[PDB]
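Lecture notes, continued. The same structure-token format from the folding unit now serves as the input rather than the output. Read the line below as a description of shape only.
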């Protein structure tokens, strides 16, 4: 009758609620974040949109560290990324400096 785990932590406890990151136009951004567990998987979300690993964005997962490399960080890429995982997710405001045709 009674079942169900409790107190489940996906990410660390020493992590901020909002990681404001800055980047230059045409540069390659990088949003790193630790995880309470490696085996656990994470999914980035831009403006509430499931991010996909493409020639532009690359979802790197080194052990207990999920880093997202955004090549050619431009206005389009600039916004608010959320590293979702299990039942929790952090924030990351990717700001783009200057501009670049295209």
């Amino acid at each position: 009758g009674s079942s169900g785990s409790s107190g489940k932590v996906v990410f660390a406890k020493e992590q901020p609620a909002h990681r404001e990151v800055q980047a230059e136009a045409g540069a390659s951004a990088t949003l790193s974040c630790e995880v309470a567990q490696a085996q656990t998987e994470v999914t980035w979300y831009k403006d509430g949109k499931k991010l996909s690993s493409s020639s532009k964005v690359r979802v790197e997962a080194v052990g207990c560290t999920r880093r997202l490399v955004v090549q050619q960080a431009g206005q389009a890429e600039a916004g608010e990324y959320s590293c979702e995982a299990g039942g929790q997710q952090l924030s990351f405001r990717l700001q783009v400096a200057g501009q670049c045709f295209g």
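Point for the exam: The chain is about 0% helix and 40% strand.
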